[PDB]
Design a protein around this ligand. Structure first.
Ligand SMILES: O=P(O)(O)OC[C@H](O)CO
Ligand SMILES: [Co+2]
Ligand SMILES: [Mg+2]
Length: 418
């Protein structure tokens, strides 16, 4: 009737040092709240975790909490498999102040009609440029001056390669960085209806001259050996920390593993922008994930979930997550606490991710994205970009095809949710 501990499965995609920090947070919560036991389980990369969560729901054994990457948001929002987080709190009779979250992040994860959070913010990032300062030195570059523009990056990459580095430049999450964020950061839409927020009748718009020229630049670098393709996700993070790759654009959340494993002096810079683009940079759009609560659980489970989510949002815990991982602080209090503890004084580049998100007030179409079936559109994008790196298709053809294929998935979602 109440003597049994309530076990609460939490399925996530936090690998390496990120996962160790998730475990530390769960363990502390469990110690302070012994009526509950949060049980984190690593289920693979974000695609694998989302697929596993959806499949488990079909058979009634979904976890209580599921970490879903940012692009899965519209899909989850239309899902009948979730209990919106604001409702989890409401029905459990626990107060939660949504205004605590930084507006960019709360907006991203909020319902259009009610303004309420449908999932809980936790790990948000923007892409940053990691660079090997030691490698810069022996290539004759100023180790305190990362390339500000793509043009500069290509130049540096050539010099780093000439100096003996195995790889000059590589990128994590190419869709997120080279197209989604490339668009926002250079003042362009990724999709219509303001990057999807204004309706399911959105179409993809990333096949414009600016994006095509950008992909062409990367392909020219690839041919020269100055750019290396190493995969669709976080593969470039290890290529950087093991010394292979001199520069990588990767999640700000890669910092946990990079700090632990890089045995050289490294720096963090902002994403390069297009030198020719007037009024660039604009602002970055977030990556990372949010925490979804699955439908069909008992009241004890939802009480425990609400308590755990509240725990994660406490200033000290939100601040600790940001400081340890490189994900940006997602509450106002966590940002202020980090600043007031002198963390940014000690670690100058540690607020880069926030600064990119807030570089300028957003244009109507640089607030984030919200597109149904985006997890599959990401795969389409990866396939088409891979056809560029192999020389099978031109940058124009690949982006045109990704738009055509991707739009088919957007119309499929539109029809499904009408
Ligand atoms: O590595 P993350 O957690 O910042 O996520 C990267 C991309 O946003 C995933 O879609
Ligand atoms: Co009992
Ligand atoms: Mg569909």
């Amino acid at each position: 009737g109440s003597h049994m501990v309530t076990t609460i499965p939490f399925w996530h995609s936090m690998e390496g040092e990120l996962g160790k920090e998730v475990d530390s947070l769960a363990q502390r919560f469990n110690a302070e709240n012994p009526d509950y036991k949060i049980v984190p389980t690593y289920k693979g990369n974000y695609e694998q975790n989302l697929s596993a969560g959806i499949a488990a729901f079909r058979t009634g054994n979904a976890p209580a909490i599921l970490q879903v990457y940012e692009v899965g948001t519209a899909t989850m929002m239309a899902s009948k498999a979730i209990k919106p987080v604001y409702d989890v709190f409401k029905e459990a009779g626990i107060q939660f102040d949504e205004s605590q979250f930084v507006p960019t992040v709360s907006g991203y994860y909020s319902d259009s009609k009610t303004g309420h959070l449908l999932s809980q913010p936790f790990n948000s990032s923007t892409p940053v440029l990691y660079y090997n300062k030691d490698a810069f030195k022996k290539a004759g570059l100023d180790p305190e001056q990362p390339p500000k523009t793509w043009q500069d990056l290509a130049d540096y990459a050539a010099k780093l390669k000439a100096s003996g580095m195995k790889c000059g430049y590589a990128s994590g999450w190419q869709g997120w960085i080279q197209l989604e964020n490339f668009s926002a950061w250079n003042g362009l839409p990724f999709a219509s209806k303001n990057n999807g927020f204004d309706g399911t009748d959105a179409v993809l718009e990333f096949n414009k001259p600016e994006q095509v020229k950008h992909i062409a630049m990367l392909e020219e670098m690839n041919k020269k050996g100055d750019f290396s393709y190493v995969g669709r996700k976080d593969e470039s993070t290890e290529k950087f920390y093991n010394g292979d790759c001199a520069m990588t654009t990767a999640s700000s959340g890669s910092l946990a593993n990079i700090r632990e494993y890089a045995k050289f002096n490294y720096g963090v810079g902002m994403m390069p922008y297009d030198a020719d683009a007037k009024d660039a940079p604009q602002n970055a759009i977030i990556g990372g994930a949010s925490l979804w609560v699955m439908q069909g659980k008992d009241k004890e489970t939802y009480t425990g979930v609400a308590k755990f989510l509240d725990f994660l949002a406490k200033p000290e815990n939100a601040a600790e997550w940001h400081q340890k991982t490189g994900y940006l602080p997602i509450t106002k209090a966590a940002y202020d606490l980090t600043r007031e503890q002198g963390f940014y004084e000690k670690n100058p580049g540690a607020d880069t991710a926030t600064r990119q998100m807030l570089n300028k007030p957003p244009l109507p179409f640089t607030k984030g994205l919200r597109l149904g079936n985006m997890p599959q559109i990401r795969v389409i994008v990866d396939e088409e970009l891979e056809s560029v790196w192999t020389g099978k298709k031109t940058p124009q053809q690949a982006l045109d095809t990704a738009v055509e294929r991707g739009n088919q998935l957007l119309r499929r979602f539109e029809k499904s949710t009408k």
